[PDB]
Design a protein around this ligand. Sequence first.
Ligand SMILES: CC(C)S[C@@H]1O[C@H](CO)[C@H](O)[C@H](O)[C@H]1O
Ligand SMILES: CC(C)S[C@@H]1O[C@H](CO)[C@H](O)[C@H](O)[C@H]1O
Ligand SMILES: [Mg+2]
Ligand SMILES: [Mg+2]
Ligand SMILES: [Mg+2]
Ligand SMILES: [Mg+2]
Ligand SMILES: [Mg+2]
Ligand code: NA
Ligand code: NA
Ligand code: NA
Ligand code: NA
Ligand code: NA
Ligand code: NA
Lengths: 193, 204, 1011
Amino acid sequence: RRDWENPGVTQLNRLAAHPPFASWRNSEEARTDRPSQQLRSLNGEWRFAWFPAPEAVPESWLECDLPEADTVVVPSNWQMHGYDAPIYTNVTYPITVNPPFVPTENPTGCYSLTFNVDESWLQEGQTRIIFDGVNSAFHLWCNGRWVGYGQDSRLPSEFDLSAFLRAGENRLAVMVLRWSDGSYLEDQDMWRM
Amino acid sequence: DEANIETHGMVPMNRLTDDPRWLPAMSERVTRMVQRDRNHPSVIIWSLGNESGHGANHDALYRWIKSVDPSRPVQYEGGGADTTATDIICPMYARVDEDQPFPAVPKWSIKKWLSLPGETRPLILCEYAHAMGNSLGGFAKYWQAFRQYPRLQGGFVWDWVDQSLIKYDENGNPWSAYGGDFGDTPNDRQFCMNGLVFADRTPH
Amino acid sequence: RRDWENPGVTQLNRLAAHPPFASWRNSEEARTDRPSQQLRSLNGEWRFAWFPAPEAVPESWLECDLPEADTVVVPSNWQMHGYDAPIYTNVTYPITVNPPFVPTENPTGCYSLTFNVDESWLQEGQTRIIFDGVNSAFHLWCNGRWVGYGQDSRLPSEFDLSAFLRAGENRLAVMVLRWSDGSYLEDQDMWRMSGIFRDVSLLHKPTTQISDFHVATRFNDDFSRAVLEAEVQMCGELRDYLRVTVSLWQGETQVASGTAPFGGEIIDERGGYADRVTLRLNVENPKLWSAEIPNLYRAVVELHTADGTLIEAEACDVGFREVRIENGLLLLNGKPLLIRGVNRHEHHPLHGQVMDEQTMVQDILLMKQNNFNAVRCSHYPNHPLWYTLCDRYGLYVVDEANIETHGMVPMNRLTDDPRWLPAMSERVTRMVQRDRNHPSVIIWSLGNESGHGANHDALYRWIKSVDPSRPVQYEGGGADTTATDIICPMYARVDEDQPFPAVPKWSIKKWLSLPGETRPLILCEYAHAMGNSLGGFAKYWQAFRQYPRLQGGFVWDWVDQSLIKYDENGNPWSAYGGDFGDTPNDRQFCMNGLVFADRTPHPALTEAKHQQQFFQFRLSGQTIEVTSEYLFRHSDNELLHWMVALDGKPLASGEVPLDVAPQGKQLIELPELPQPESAGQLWLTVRVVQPNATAWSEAGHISAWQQWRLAENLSVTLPAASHAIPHLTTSEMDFCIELGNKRWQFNRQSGFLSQMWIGDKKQLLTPLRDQFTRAPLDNDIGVSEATRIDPNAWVERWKAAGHYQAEAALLQCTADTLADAVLITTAHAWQHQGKTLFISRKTYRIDGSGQMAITVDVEVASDTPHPARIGLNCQLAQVAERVNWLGLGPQENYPDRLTAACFDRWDLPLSDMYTPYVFPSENGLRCGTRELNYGPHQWRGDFQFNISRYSQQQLMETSHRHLLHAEEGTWLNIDGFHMGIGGDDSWSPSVSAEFQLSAGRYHYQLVWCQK
Ligand SMILES: CC(C)S[C@@H]1O[C@H](CO)[C@H](O)[C@H](O)[C@H]1O
Ligand SMILES: CC(C)S[C@@H]1O[C@H](CO)[C@H](O)[C@H](O)[C@H]1O
Ligand SMILES: [Mg+2]
Ligand SMILES: [Mg+2]
Ligand SMILES: [Mg+2]
Ligand SMILES: [Mg+2]
Ligand SMILES: [Mg+2]
Ligand code: NA
Ligand code: NA
Ligand code: NA
Ligand code: NA
Ligand code: NA
Ligand code: NA
C-alpha cells in the first residue's frame, strides 16, 4: 500500500490522542507525581540496521534479529550514529518536490527490541505502546505480527498491544522511513534527520 | 505551542495549505496537539504552524481551535502575518521604523502596522533580531518601541541555540560543523546557526 | 485492508473534484451546450451478481463474467430489481451502531461491463471513468487490475483509466458494498438502498488541460455594472505559448472576452500559481438572474495556443446575481427574498433513487406552477442535471453536503470527533468544488441532523473562506449555532414555543428578537405534510409577511417516498416501511409529501399554492388593491378576472389588465353591480390569469385568487301554504311519520331515526346517529404504536377516554303533533364505564312540505379530551354519481386548511370526494357548506361534510388504501364542527387551540329534504 506516499493515510490502527497519562493505581502517587508502576520506559539498548529503501528489508527481520544489526541507544537519530548524513537545507526541500511522492531511495531504519512483559499486564486490562517521536513515518510489528502505522514526527503515536504480547519475552520491529508524504509538511529550517 | 506544519519550499507557499486534499493531514497535526497539550498552564497561545503561506485549511483549523478551546488565542504568521487566521499580528522580521513593502505580504514598520486602517489587534513578533553570528545590532530599538506602545507586546528572538553539530577531526578532535559539512548537498551552510548561545550553551 | 471499515480512508486513487466537464474540441459546441464526442455514457446493460458479503466474491469475477450473473440496467438500485430489500428506517441506524464497523453480512453488488474503447482515446490524452453515484462504497478494477476505491454515495467518483485500457474490448469490475463507514454519515430519513444509481461515463481530456475553473460575478451598488471573474487552472506541461481565453455570450452575441497566458498574481513570499490565471471581464447593464427571470449568459473557457490552435474548451451557464446578508436580511440582487421553498428528496416509486430528466422537469414545473421559488437538496448533493434545470427554469437552491448522523447518541458524537473531520470534510469540500458555478445555488448547507460539533465550525469557516458569495447554513445543535449565517429551525411553530432542553424550538417570531440575535430566519423544514395535513399553513405565511426577518421556509416535503408493489393479478400498489419485510422500520413516516409518488397532488398542495401567491389584495368598497410581491418583474403576463355571484349564481364578471411594478400596488375600480333581486350572500372572487404561455406554464394559468363577501340579503319572506299535515303513528317500539310518498321512522328503543322512505324505497342502511370521532389522521397518531404507546398523542387520549367505544344511552324520546308538523325530541348520553362524555339533545321537526328540520345541542364534559368532531352519520342506501354542494371547494378542506378553497357551487363525481392517502384516515371533508346534494337528497344548513363508500370504521381499521373496499350504499358524515388536522409536526400534538373543540356546548341545525 505504500502508505507513505499517500497524504490520505497518516496512520493505521493508531489510538486517539490525550493528555499525559500514567494509570496510577494509588491516588497518593498520582497526587505527588511519583513514578507509576504502570508506565514503563523502553528506552535503552535496541537493535538497528540501516537499509537504502523499504524494498530492501528482508521479511526474516519480522521474526528474527538480523545478525548484521548493531546494538544502539534509543532514542536517537540514526544520522548521529553515522549510518547516513544529516542534511542542512533551509527552504528548498531536501527531496524533489512532487507531492505526494518521495524518492525510491528512501533511507529506512529497522529498529527492534526484545523485552519482557509481566504476566499481570496481560491477565487484565490493556497494554499499549507509545512512540513519543518517530521521524518521519513507520510501520510497527509485534512478535512477527503487524500492528499499525503512523505519521507526524513530533507527536506521540500509540498502539494497543494487548492482543499481540505474551508473558515473558516479546520482540517489536519498527520500520522507520526517512521520507514520507508527511515530509511535505515538515519543511522547517533545521537539520533533516 | 505550534503545530508541526511547515511547507516553506512549495511554490507558492500555500500550495498544499490551500488544497482541501491536504486538509486531513494538516488537521491531525493541529488537533492531536491540542488534545495532548491543552491542560498545560504554560501554553498560553496556539500556533497553526509556520511558513506555509495562508490557505483555506488554516482558516478552518483556526476555527476548530477557537471552538474547542476558547481559553487561548490562536496565532499564525503565514500569508502576511495579519490574516483572518490569526488573533495576533505576528510578523517575522518586521523592522521598528522601516517599512518593507513586499508585494502581497509586506512587512510594515511594527509601529505603523498597528495603526493601519481598521486594525486593532495586538502585535507580537513571532521572530525578530536574527542572532546569526555577530548580530543583534539594533536590538535596543525594538525594546524601546515595545515599551512605548501599548499594543506592541514584544516578541520571540530567532533563536535560542546554534544548530551546529559535533564532528571529529582525523585525530579525534571535536569541532563544530554546519551545512555541507557532512557531504550534504544542496545545503544552506551556516544558516543553521542563529542562536544567542553556541550549541554547548556557552553564551554568544 | 477492509477500507470500508476505516473512516480514515474515503477513497484510493480518486481524482480531484471539479465542475461539470465535457472536453469539447470545438468552441461552438461548447458555447451552445451540444453533446461532446469526448464525453461518452456507459449507461445501459451491465452484468450483475449479488453476494451476501465481500468475502464471498470469487477471484474469478475479476477477469471473467459469472455465468450466474444477470444482465441489468445501470443506473439502478439493486433493491429495485429484487435482489434484496430496501429498508425504511427514519432515525435509528439500519445497522448496529458500532463505528466504524459494519455488519459482516454486508450485501455486495458485483457489477461488470464489457465495452469497447477506440484506440484513438489511448493514443494520447487521458481517459477517466466517472461514477456519479455509487451507494455506499466501492472498489474498481479494469481488465482485472485494481484501480481504486471511493465513498460518499452522492458525489461523483472519478479515476484515470489511461494506463489500464487496451484498444478494443475492456472489462470493468465494480464491487459495491451496501454498508461502509460512510454509512455512519448517511443516516437520512429515507429508504436505505444501494448500487450504481447515478450515471457512469467515460471522459477524454488532453494531457494539457483545463483542470478547474471558478466563475464569480461582482456588481456595483445598483447592479448596473458587473465584473465577471474566471479563475482557471490547468494540469499538464506548462509552455509559454499556452493561453486561456474566457468569452461571455448573451444568446448569440459575444458581450466580452479576455485572453492571457498562465501565471497568476503573486500570492506570497514564494511567488504565485504558474498553473493558473484569472480573467476579468466587465459587463455593463447585465441581465440579472433570479427565480423570477432566470436570465443566463454563457461563459466559454478555451485552452489554446498563442497562434490560435484550440486545445480544449469547457463552459458553463452564468447567472449574474449577488447573494448577501445585510442588516439581518437575506438579499438577492439587493432585495429581500421571501422563500416559498420545499425540501425534495430524489425518489421514484418504480426506480427507487435513480433520477431521470423527465421526472425532474415534471417536479420543477409542478413546483413553479404551485408558487414555489426554492428547493432544498434534502440532504445530499443531487444528480448534476438538477442544478442545470434550476438555473434555467429559475429556482433558488440550497445545496447540502451528504452528512447525516441522526441515530448517534448524542447526535454530535461523530461531528465533534476530530477523527471524523476528514470524512466530513470531503462531503463538504467536494460538493463545493462541483457545484460552485451554478447560479441557482444561493446557500450552502453543512448537512442535516448531526448535532453541532467542532467539525461543523471548521467546515463552515472553510466555505466562508473559499466561496464568499453564498451564505452558509446548518440547523443541527439548535438552529442558531456559530456554524450558521441563518437561523434555520425545523418545525419551530409560529407563536408557540417548544422549550426543549439544550435545543429549544422557540416561536419563530420570538426567536428573531432573542437578546443579541440579529440573523434572518428561514425554516429549513416546516409544515410536515404527512397524510391529511398542512393544518395551520396560513399562520406561517401571515407571519412571514408581517416580519421582515422571517424570510420563509422549505416545506417538508415534496413527494411521498412510497414504493410500487404488485398484487396477484399484477395491479400495482403503494408500499411503505415494513412492506418489504424490512424491520425494524418506521412505517408510513416515509410519506410526507405535497404530492403522491406518481406526482398526483395531495389536496394540501393547493393550500400551499394559495398561501405562496405573489399578489396580495385588499378590498374597499368598489376598489380592489393589488400589491405585487415580485422583487424584480413587472406583472407583464397577468390580467385580473373578477366575478360576482349570488349563492353560486353568476351575477356579473369582468377582466382588467394588471400593470403592477415589483413591490408596487395597483387600484382597480369595479363598476356598479346590479345587486341581486333576491336573498343570499353575494361573493366576489378574483383570479390572476397568465394569458401567455411560459416555459413552465400554459396560457391561461391561474397564479392567484382571493374572495370576499359582498352584500348579504337575509331572507325574511316566509310564504307558501300548509299543504298537508304529517301523520304520526305510535307503537311501543316506534314513532312513525308519513307525508305523501315519504315516511320517517324513529326507533323508541334507541332514540334514532332508523329508516326513511321515499315511495316504497328504504333509504338508510344504518340509522342516523351522532358521531364524535374520526378515523385518526397521521397527525392524530404521531409516533404512537400498539407496541409503544404515546399517551400524549390525540388518538391515544381519545382511546383512553373511551371515545371510540362510547355507548349511547337513551335519556328521552317523545313525539308531539303540532298544528302543521310532527315534533320528535331525543336526548342521549354517551358514556364510558360510568363517565358521561357527551350529551346530545335534538329535535326533529317534520312539516307539511316534507322537510325535516333537525336541531342538535351537544354538551362535552370539560374533562374529557376535546373530540375530533361533533356531527351525525349514516349509511345511505343509495349510490349516486355526482355530489353537488354550495360551499368551500372544490378540493378537500379542513378548518385549519381551507384558505385556498372558494365558496361557490361545486359538482363532482363521487370518487372525487374521497382522497386516497396511502395510509387511510378521515378524508374528503369540505367545510362551510350551506347545501349539499346527493341522489334525491338535500341537506341545508352550515356544516362540514364528507361522503364516500368507506366507513370511518373501515378507514380506521385499514393501513393501506389498496385494501379498502366500497361498502354498500354511501357513508355520509355531516358535522356541525370538526377539529383541525394540524401538521406543524407529525410527532406531537400540533392542532392549534383555536381549532380544538373546547367550547363545552355546541349547536348546529340541519334541514333534510328530498328532491
Ligand atoms: C533566508 C530567508 C529568505 S527565509 C528565513 O530564513 C531564516 C534562516 O535562519 C529563518 O529560517 C526564517 O524563519 C526564514 O524566514
Ligand atoms: C419523528 C421525529 C423525532 S424526527 C423527524 O422525523 C421526520 C419524519 O418525517 C423528518 O425526518 C424530520 O426531519 C425529523 O426531525
Ligand atoms: Mg501517508
Ligand atoms: Mg522556513
Ligand atoms: Mg473507509
Ligand atoms: Mg433524520
Ligand atoms: Mg436533452
Ligand atoms: Na508595549
Ligand atoms: Na536558520
Ligand atoms: Na418577511
Ligand atoms: Na419522513
Ligand atoms: Na399584465
Ligand atoms: Na387508517
